[PDB]
Amino acid sequence: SGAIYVGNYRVVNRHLATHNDWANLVWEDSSRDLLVSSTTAQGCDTIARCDCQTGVYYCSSRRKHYPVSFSKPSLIFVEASEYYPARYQSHLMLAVGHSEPGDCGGILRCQHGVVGIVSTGGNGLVGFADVRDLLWLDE
Ligand SMILES: C[C@@H]1CCCC[C@H]1OC(=O)N1CCC[C@H](C(N)=O)C1
Ligand SMILES: [Zn+2]
Numbered sequence: 122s123g124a125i126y127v128g129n130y131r132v133v134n135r136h137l138a139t140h141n142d143w144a145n146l147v148w149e150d151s152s153r154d155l156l157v158s159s160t161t162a163q164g165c166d167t168i169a170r171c172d173c174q175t176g177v178y179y180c181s182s183r184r185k186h187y188p189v190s191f192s193k194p195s196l197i198f199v200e201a202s203e204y205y206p207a208r209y210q211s212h213l214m215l216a217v218g219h220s221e222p223g224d225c226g227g228i229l230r231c232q233h234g235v236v237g238i239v240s241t242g243g244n245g246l247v248g249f250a251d252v253r254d255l256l257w258l259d260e
Pocket of ligand 2: 125158170171172173231233234
């Protein structure tokens with residue numbers, strides 16, 4: 122679990138969104154595993170606007186942060202799960218690292234701010250849904 126709070130927006134994994142996220146929907150994209158909902162309180166986070174390919178992410182299943190090198194956002198095949206059929210997920214960045222069920226929502230950050238959130242795992246890999254291209258989160 123986990124979310125990004127920026128301005129009057131809450132960014133979560135689409136497959137973990139709650140009834141309240143859907144009742145306050147701003148934007149969602151099943152192909153990216155993202156959903157953004159509106160909040161009444163001002164958020165705690167700032168978004169990176171950069172091309173970093175190294176950063177640090179939080180892994181809840183180990184209660185620790187790990188440094189990673191990750192690929193540029195791309196279209197990657199993701200196997201069928203109880204949340205989605207087998208499909209290509211877009212704007213996804215892979216890295217070698219630990220990720221198990223429950224780790225989705227962990228934040229990946231670089232020196233410029235939040236880069237994205239954990240969205241895929243298994244096989245000694247961790248995949249992150251990029252948010253750096255969503256410029257409207259800042260306004
Ligand atoms: C994080 C899990 C670790 C063990 C192996 C499976 C890993 O699950 C996943 O990669 N997904 C399940 C939830 C939905 C994700 C998505 N963005 O489509 C894909
Ligand atoms: Zn950066």
